[PDB]
Symmetry: C5
Subunit: 376 residues, 5 copies
């Protein structure tokens, strides 16, 4: 993930211009190799046409170039690219939205599962670790970085995500499918055991816990679904064929013919086709957007930081369920204890952001006196 | 379903180009027959125009040619294709999202329905089997592969999904409609019986179970709705008419008129119309995306693996409700029992994925001492 | 509703081509009259121009035709058609999604409302009949077919949906609004009475019942919303003007001018304008999609089968809440009672659909021995 | 709100044609003034060029018109109009969907809040009046018609929406913000008081009531948000500049040059530019769609009937919570008391709508005996 | 935020025209610097070409201008601008929808947390202050204005949002991540303590409180997500490259060549390129829409008033949970106590908005006498 929110906070002079100086996760870094190959092919064809052929062959090549230039269509490639990239971006944001965050569940666990003793600590930590284990299982199934971090369940055990007992239980329960669903059944059974043992005081609290755990399960299932059901290969191949056919016919139809022949559009020999290269940058970058976002769990610069998410989730959830359980700051009257209308101060740098309240669009409507009497 | 997520994990050199060497679910496999028919018709017309005409019918054909090519438009076909295919893809993903997964229900059943004895085993298995039976009923109603697997309720009984008693009950209840809704009423009545018999300890747990079952029912109803209410036949016919009219007028417009006659644009003879063939591939593949995704429950290469989903759901749900009920790994302190800030290790292949936490876009904003002072 | 899902299950040769032979809900049936009018007007103009005027008037008409030829724009009409039809299709699917289905409510009623005696039967049937009565009230308010079936509350009483007592209660409660909301108040009060009388054991069950009834009420309110708040008449008139201004200027600008005058685009006299007729079919069918779908509760071929939905809902709900209450098939161990991994069989026609499980996109990643070692 | 759903129920001959004869909420009524101004300016320019200008000035004006007619493009204005109008329509439908309907809350109040005496009547009426008061407060904040009806809280008190005691309490609570949120806190406190006093029998019923009231609060907050956060002024100005630049360029570029000079585009003088006028109608009406829908709470013909909604909500909610509380029609066996398959009759006008049930797309698949045999 | 809802309430004469006179948040203020730079560069090139070079160099520049003005395509830039700006607007409205509002939670707290004494006041205020503190933490993490107001946790303490005890607890809990999640765990633990101490009477009320808190947590997490996972830099760079390449090739291709050479489109020298400047305004303003909305928490005119939101939330929540707890207006019969059909009056200015109720689109369907008979 490349973040430039601070840079694009305000719509200043050249705000998007200053983003063109970035390298990581950029268009140049994405398509420099393709541009180099295109350059090599274009100039090889140019040299072949210029100083490798006879007069009749050059005339035939010029006829072919004139035939090719008219066959360069921008409406269809733009149309397919726009919708394909829109679909890819929508799926990418949905995939991020299905990343499981254990925050609600950990707050509920810390509140509900009672006991400041070792048994209560074990119960809370085991529940939140079941949640984290399910999350890391689906993440290592769907993300190459997480898989490289934990290439096996033995690696998961050595990293502390799984106990050896849990690993043995998983091996005993092994079926010819992905076993990421097992920790949710473990969580449900452990929560029922906690309620029966008196650690969870009410079945409504049990239901809230299981609802949050079910939401996490649904998010993980959506992640698995997005990993499994790819965008249709026919659609991807169609958009690729459009782009590459465009920039393969351009290789011939954008060649600088001899200016002596006084062609309508080939009166000048600029050597470099700057507009063809600009179109290459634009269209191939538009395609590279979809190329990068089609699997947002790879190792691209703009892919998600799944390893950081895993580490943060583990640390935060463990802290919340263990140290923060029934550990509150002292409850004391606040600064505005007897102030009916509190007014927090503004700094000198933020005094200009103090605004009057918006009371509605109809507030300033002016009505005459007679217009306001109720009619019988 | 054809998966290439691992192939497109990173935006590497020619990442989408390497996808053009596939055959399953590919554009070539989808439109090779149409391309062969187009080839045959095009070259039949070419041979008829040159070796089977006279010097006046030929001259007329040329007149028709330069008329047909001038009456070729791409914006309308691109528009109708883009919008229609976008609608088809949206409906395809919605249809996948409405595929019922019994994971939440099975976790709730395993947790809630108490009893490690034969009666408890039977109750849990029967509830989850009612869920699976409803899912398989709607799936065999809407999916050709599942129907070929289970062409009759007797086949369902022989497959173990339905008991002979359940089959007799369904036959007794037979209405002149699709009877896929019956297992949900069965589940509701059996869950009420379990609660009244003490197997379910609290009506809040009963409500949670029924909420999960009703979510499954809504998903199955949406699947039935998508099977029944097709995309408007008028819209499908409009897009088909656009594409086929384009590629029928191309048959005359894209003919290679003889070089001897004088015509702008037609000055040489390239035999093979490579640009017309590229356009055919692009547009007919764009249409084949919709042709394949319009019913994602057929037997195309990119259609859903409903049979595998059924088998996996049955196995996983039965295991979860029978063998995993109150069967937990031993609860022991984890690796980070007294570690305030756990830090799982990174492998050599993943050490580069260790990232600092993102604390917000405002973190690096610099303010002076006078700027930070609160104003009175 | 016209269904062709079975016909479009697989992407076969000419899959969308075989849909052009349909008559019901087809483009031909939708626009044959407008095509006939366009034909008649076009050939009236053609016959007037060639044999009705003098040479000067003919030359003036040729100049006007050339002027009109350059004012035939496809981009704007395509844009407005695409956006408007997309909106119409979205609203059409939303309207279908807001059609109330009593399945969840009927399962909850059958489970929760106890009593196999006459009073319990009456209570369950009355609750489900209140649901069905509200549904039929909103449906007869919004659908012409349902209104023609039940043109009056007396017709509803004769049909059995409403009792004479309920009819008199409605007449007593009569207000100058649509009274489709009354059955939900009746349902809430009757459910409260049932809970107070002991027929409903727990207020949590009461809450579940009322949540389902409120979901049905929201769906009915959305149906009323879509029936009341139409797509803006200005937008509909704009798209109609865009289509008709195109096909009114085509009448003059697509006339076959005399070939003797040797105009650029009028060398040939083909009599029948095939491209103009194809464009008429394409665009007028695109508009006919919106014309048919703008009110999906009319009597079009592709409109919803609301009468069938009403009949099916009544029958299914009554059966579920009366005959299926506490009436379950015999509970006995299944075929996989002691099978850890059930494997239901495949038929000969479905053996090709047996596939291995998808274990994740990262499953096949190959790592070296040194790469997999945890770093300190 | 202009309704034509009955007119567009079926896709008949000229179904959208017959909508062009409407005046209320129509394109003519929306843009007649703009069309008159554009007409006056166009003909002023034409007369000035024809008469006032000398020969050299006319020659310069002719060159200017020729240079202007090639700077009039439809693609960018079409894009900006389509996307902007789509966003405006989406926001308009969302704004209507956020209009609060008290139906679910009123059913819950009537059911849950017990007591047929004066105290129970007062409690139910006060709760539903708090809901209606919050709704009318946000509506008078966001809607010009509702503000004109109730220009002050004193007007609200005279209209009966607010009790003078409630007015005094609001004045005591007065804060420098919109106080539409106060009745929700009032409702919560009154519901808690009712539960503590025994009028509400169960805290789960209390929770259901508060959940419905909170849904209403969320809808009202969304209405306030839509009123406050307008569509970006930069975007609105961009679309306005596009349209107006188009039709200011057209003023000169569409002038009928003198036919004597014999430019190809201006060979004859039609006087009236019918195509420019049709384009004006199309584009300015497309913009008028967004102009009318940008604030759907104004006083346009297609704007919402917020006053009627307020009146209907008040009447219906008061009736439901006061006269309909525990007032049910007599519970008697229905027409299908012992009928397993109820078949309500059809009328002569609805006989053709009786259809067989759709049993699934796989129903008609034909399989051989050998194909249907299970394999080992 | 710039509001013009009252200005655009009605679709009057030139309603969008009158919005072109605004300055705050306007296209002029957004792109005047870019337009000045474009002006300077264009006229520098013009003055170079006019009198800086020799005749041969001027001829070469003229050929370059002719060959550059033929490579200006509005199609791709329009496509990418439309799609990218639509994505930006969608994300902007989602970011607004994820702004946390404590209204539902404060109503639930005021209702549920009992006690009119000092301890009850402290408990309610502390809970609502935990909610406000979490909101302000995420807002100061994501918003530059809020960060400038509160550049440190000590600033938060001095402002009254945090007590010294809470600051000391946060410092104890300090983790190398954003600590905005801590107040939710604090709220959960404090609510559980309140329920155990008898201040909250029922665990269902506890569950409702925690559900509202978790909804707020989800909103804050979505805000953090939008701050962190920005729009792909490759996509932003692609759209920027498209726009700037267009307006860089325009700098040369839109130059007024010598009229003496009688170029096809350079016959007249108007000095000022009005249409090029209009295109600059249109396209650069369309890009400035996305530039302003890409981070809606900056300090642009159309960016959100997060400081006002914070102040209003604090004041309103404190008032609701402290002063309005169990403080209700006197319950007395209303104006319509014995009126079955209340009819609130209309003012003179609003008497025209009294409309008859809409009874459904099928209301006016007229059927013959014999058409209404039920048939056997
Ligand atoms: Ca990637
Ligand atoms: Ca298919
Ligand atoms: Ca219809
Ligand atoms: Ca309006
Ligand atoms: Ca901004």
């Amino acid at each position: 993930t490349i973040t430039y929110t601070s840079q694009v906070a305000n719509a200043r002079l050249g705000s998007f211009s200053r983003l063109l100086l970035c390298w990581r996760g950029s268009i140049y870094k994405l398509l420099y190799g393709e541009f180099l190959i295109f350059l090599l092919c274009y100039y090889i064809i140019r040299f072949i046409y210029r100083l490798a052929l006879t007069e009749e062959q050059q005339l035939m090549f010029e006829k072919l170039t004139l035939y090719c230039d008219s066959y360069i269509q921008l409406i269809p490639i733009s149309f397919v690219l726009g919708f394909y990239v829109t679909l890819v971006v929508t799926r990418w944001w949905n995939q991020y939205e299905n990343l499981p965050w254990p925050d609600r569940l950990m707050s509920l666990v810390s509140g509900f599962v009672e006991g400041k003793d070792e048994q209560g600590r074990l119960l809370r930590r085991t529940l939140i670790r079941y949640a984290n284990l399910g999350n890391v299982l689906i993440l290592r199934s769907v993300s190459t970085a997480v898989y490289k971090r934990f290439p096996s369940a033995q690696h998961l055990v050595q990293a502390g995500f799984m106990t050896p007992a849990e690993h043995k239980q998983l091996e005993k329960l092994s079926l010819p499918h992905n076993m990421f669903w097992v920790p949710w059944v473990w969580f449900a059974n452990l929560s029922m055991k906690a309620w029966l043992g008196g650690r969870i005081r009410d079945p409504i609290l049990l239901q809230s816990l299981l609802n949050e755990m079910n939401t996490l399960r649904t998010q993980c299932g959506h992640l698995y679904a997005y990993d499994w059901i790819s965008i249709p290969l026919v659609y991807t191949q169609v958009v690729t064929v459009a782009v590459y056919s465009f920039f393969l016919t351009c290789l011939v139809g954008r060649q600088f013919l001899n200016p002596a022949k006084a062609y309508p559009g080939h009166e000048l020999d600029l050597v470099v086709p700057v507009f063809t290269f600009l179109q290459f940058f634009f269209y191939v970058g538009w395609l590279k957007v979809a190329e990068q976002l089609i699997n947002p769990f790879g190792e691209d610069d703009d892919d998600f930081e799944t390893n950081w998410i895993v580490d943060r989730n583990l640390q935060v959830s463990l802290l919340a369920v263990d140290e923060m359980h029934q550990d509150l700051p002292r409850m004391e009257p606040d600064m505005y204890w007897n102030k009916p209308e509190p007014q927090p101060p503004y700094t000198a740098a933020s005094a200009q952001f103090r605004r009057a309240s918006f009371m509605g669009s109809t507030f300033n409507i002016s009505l005459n006196k007679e217009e306001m009497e109720f009619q019988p």
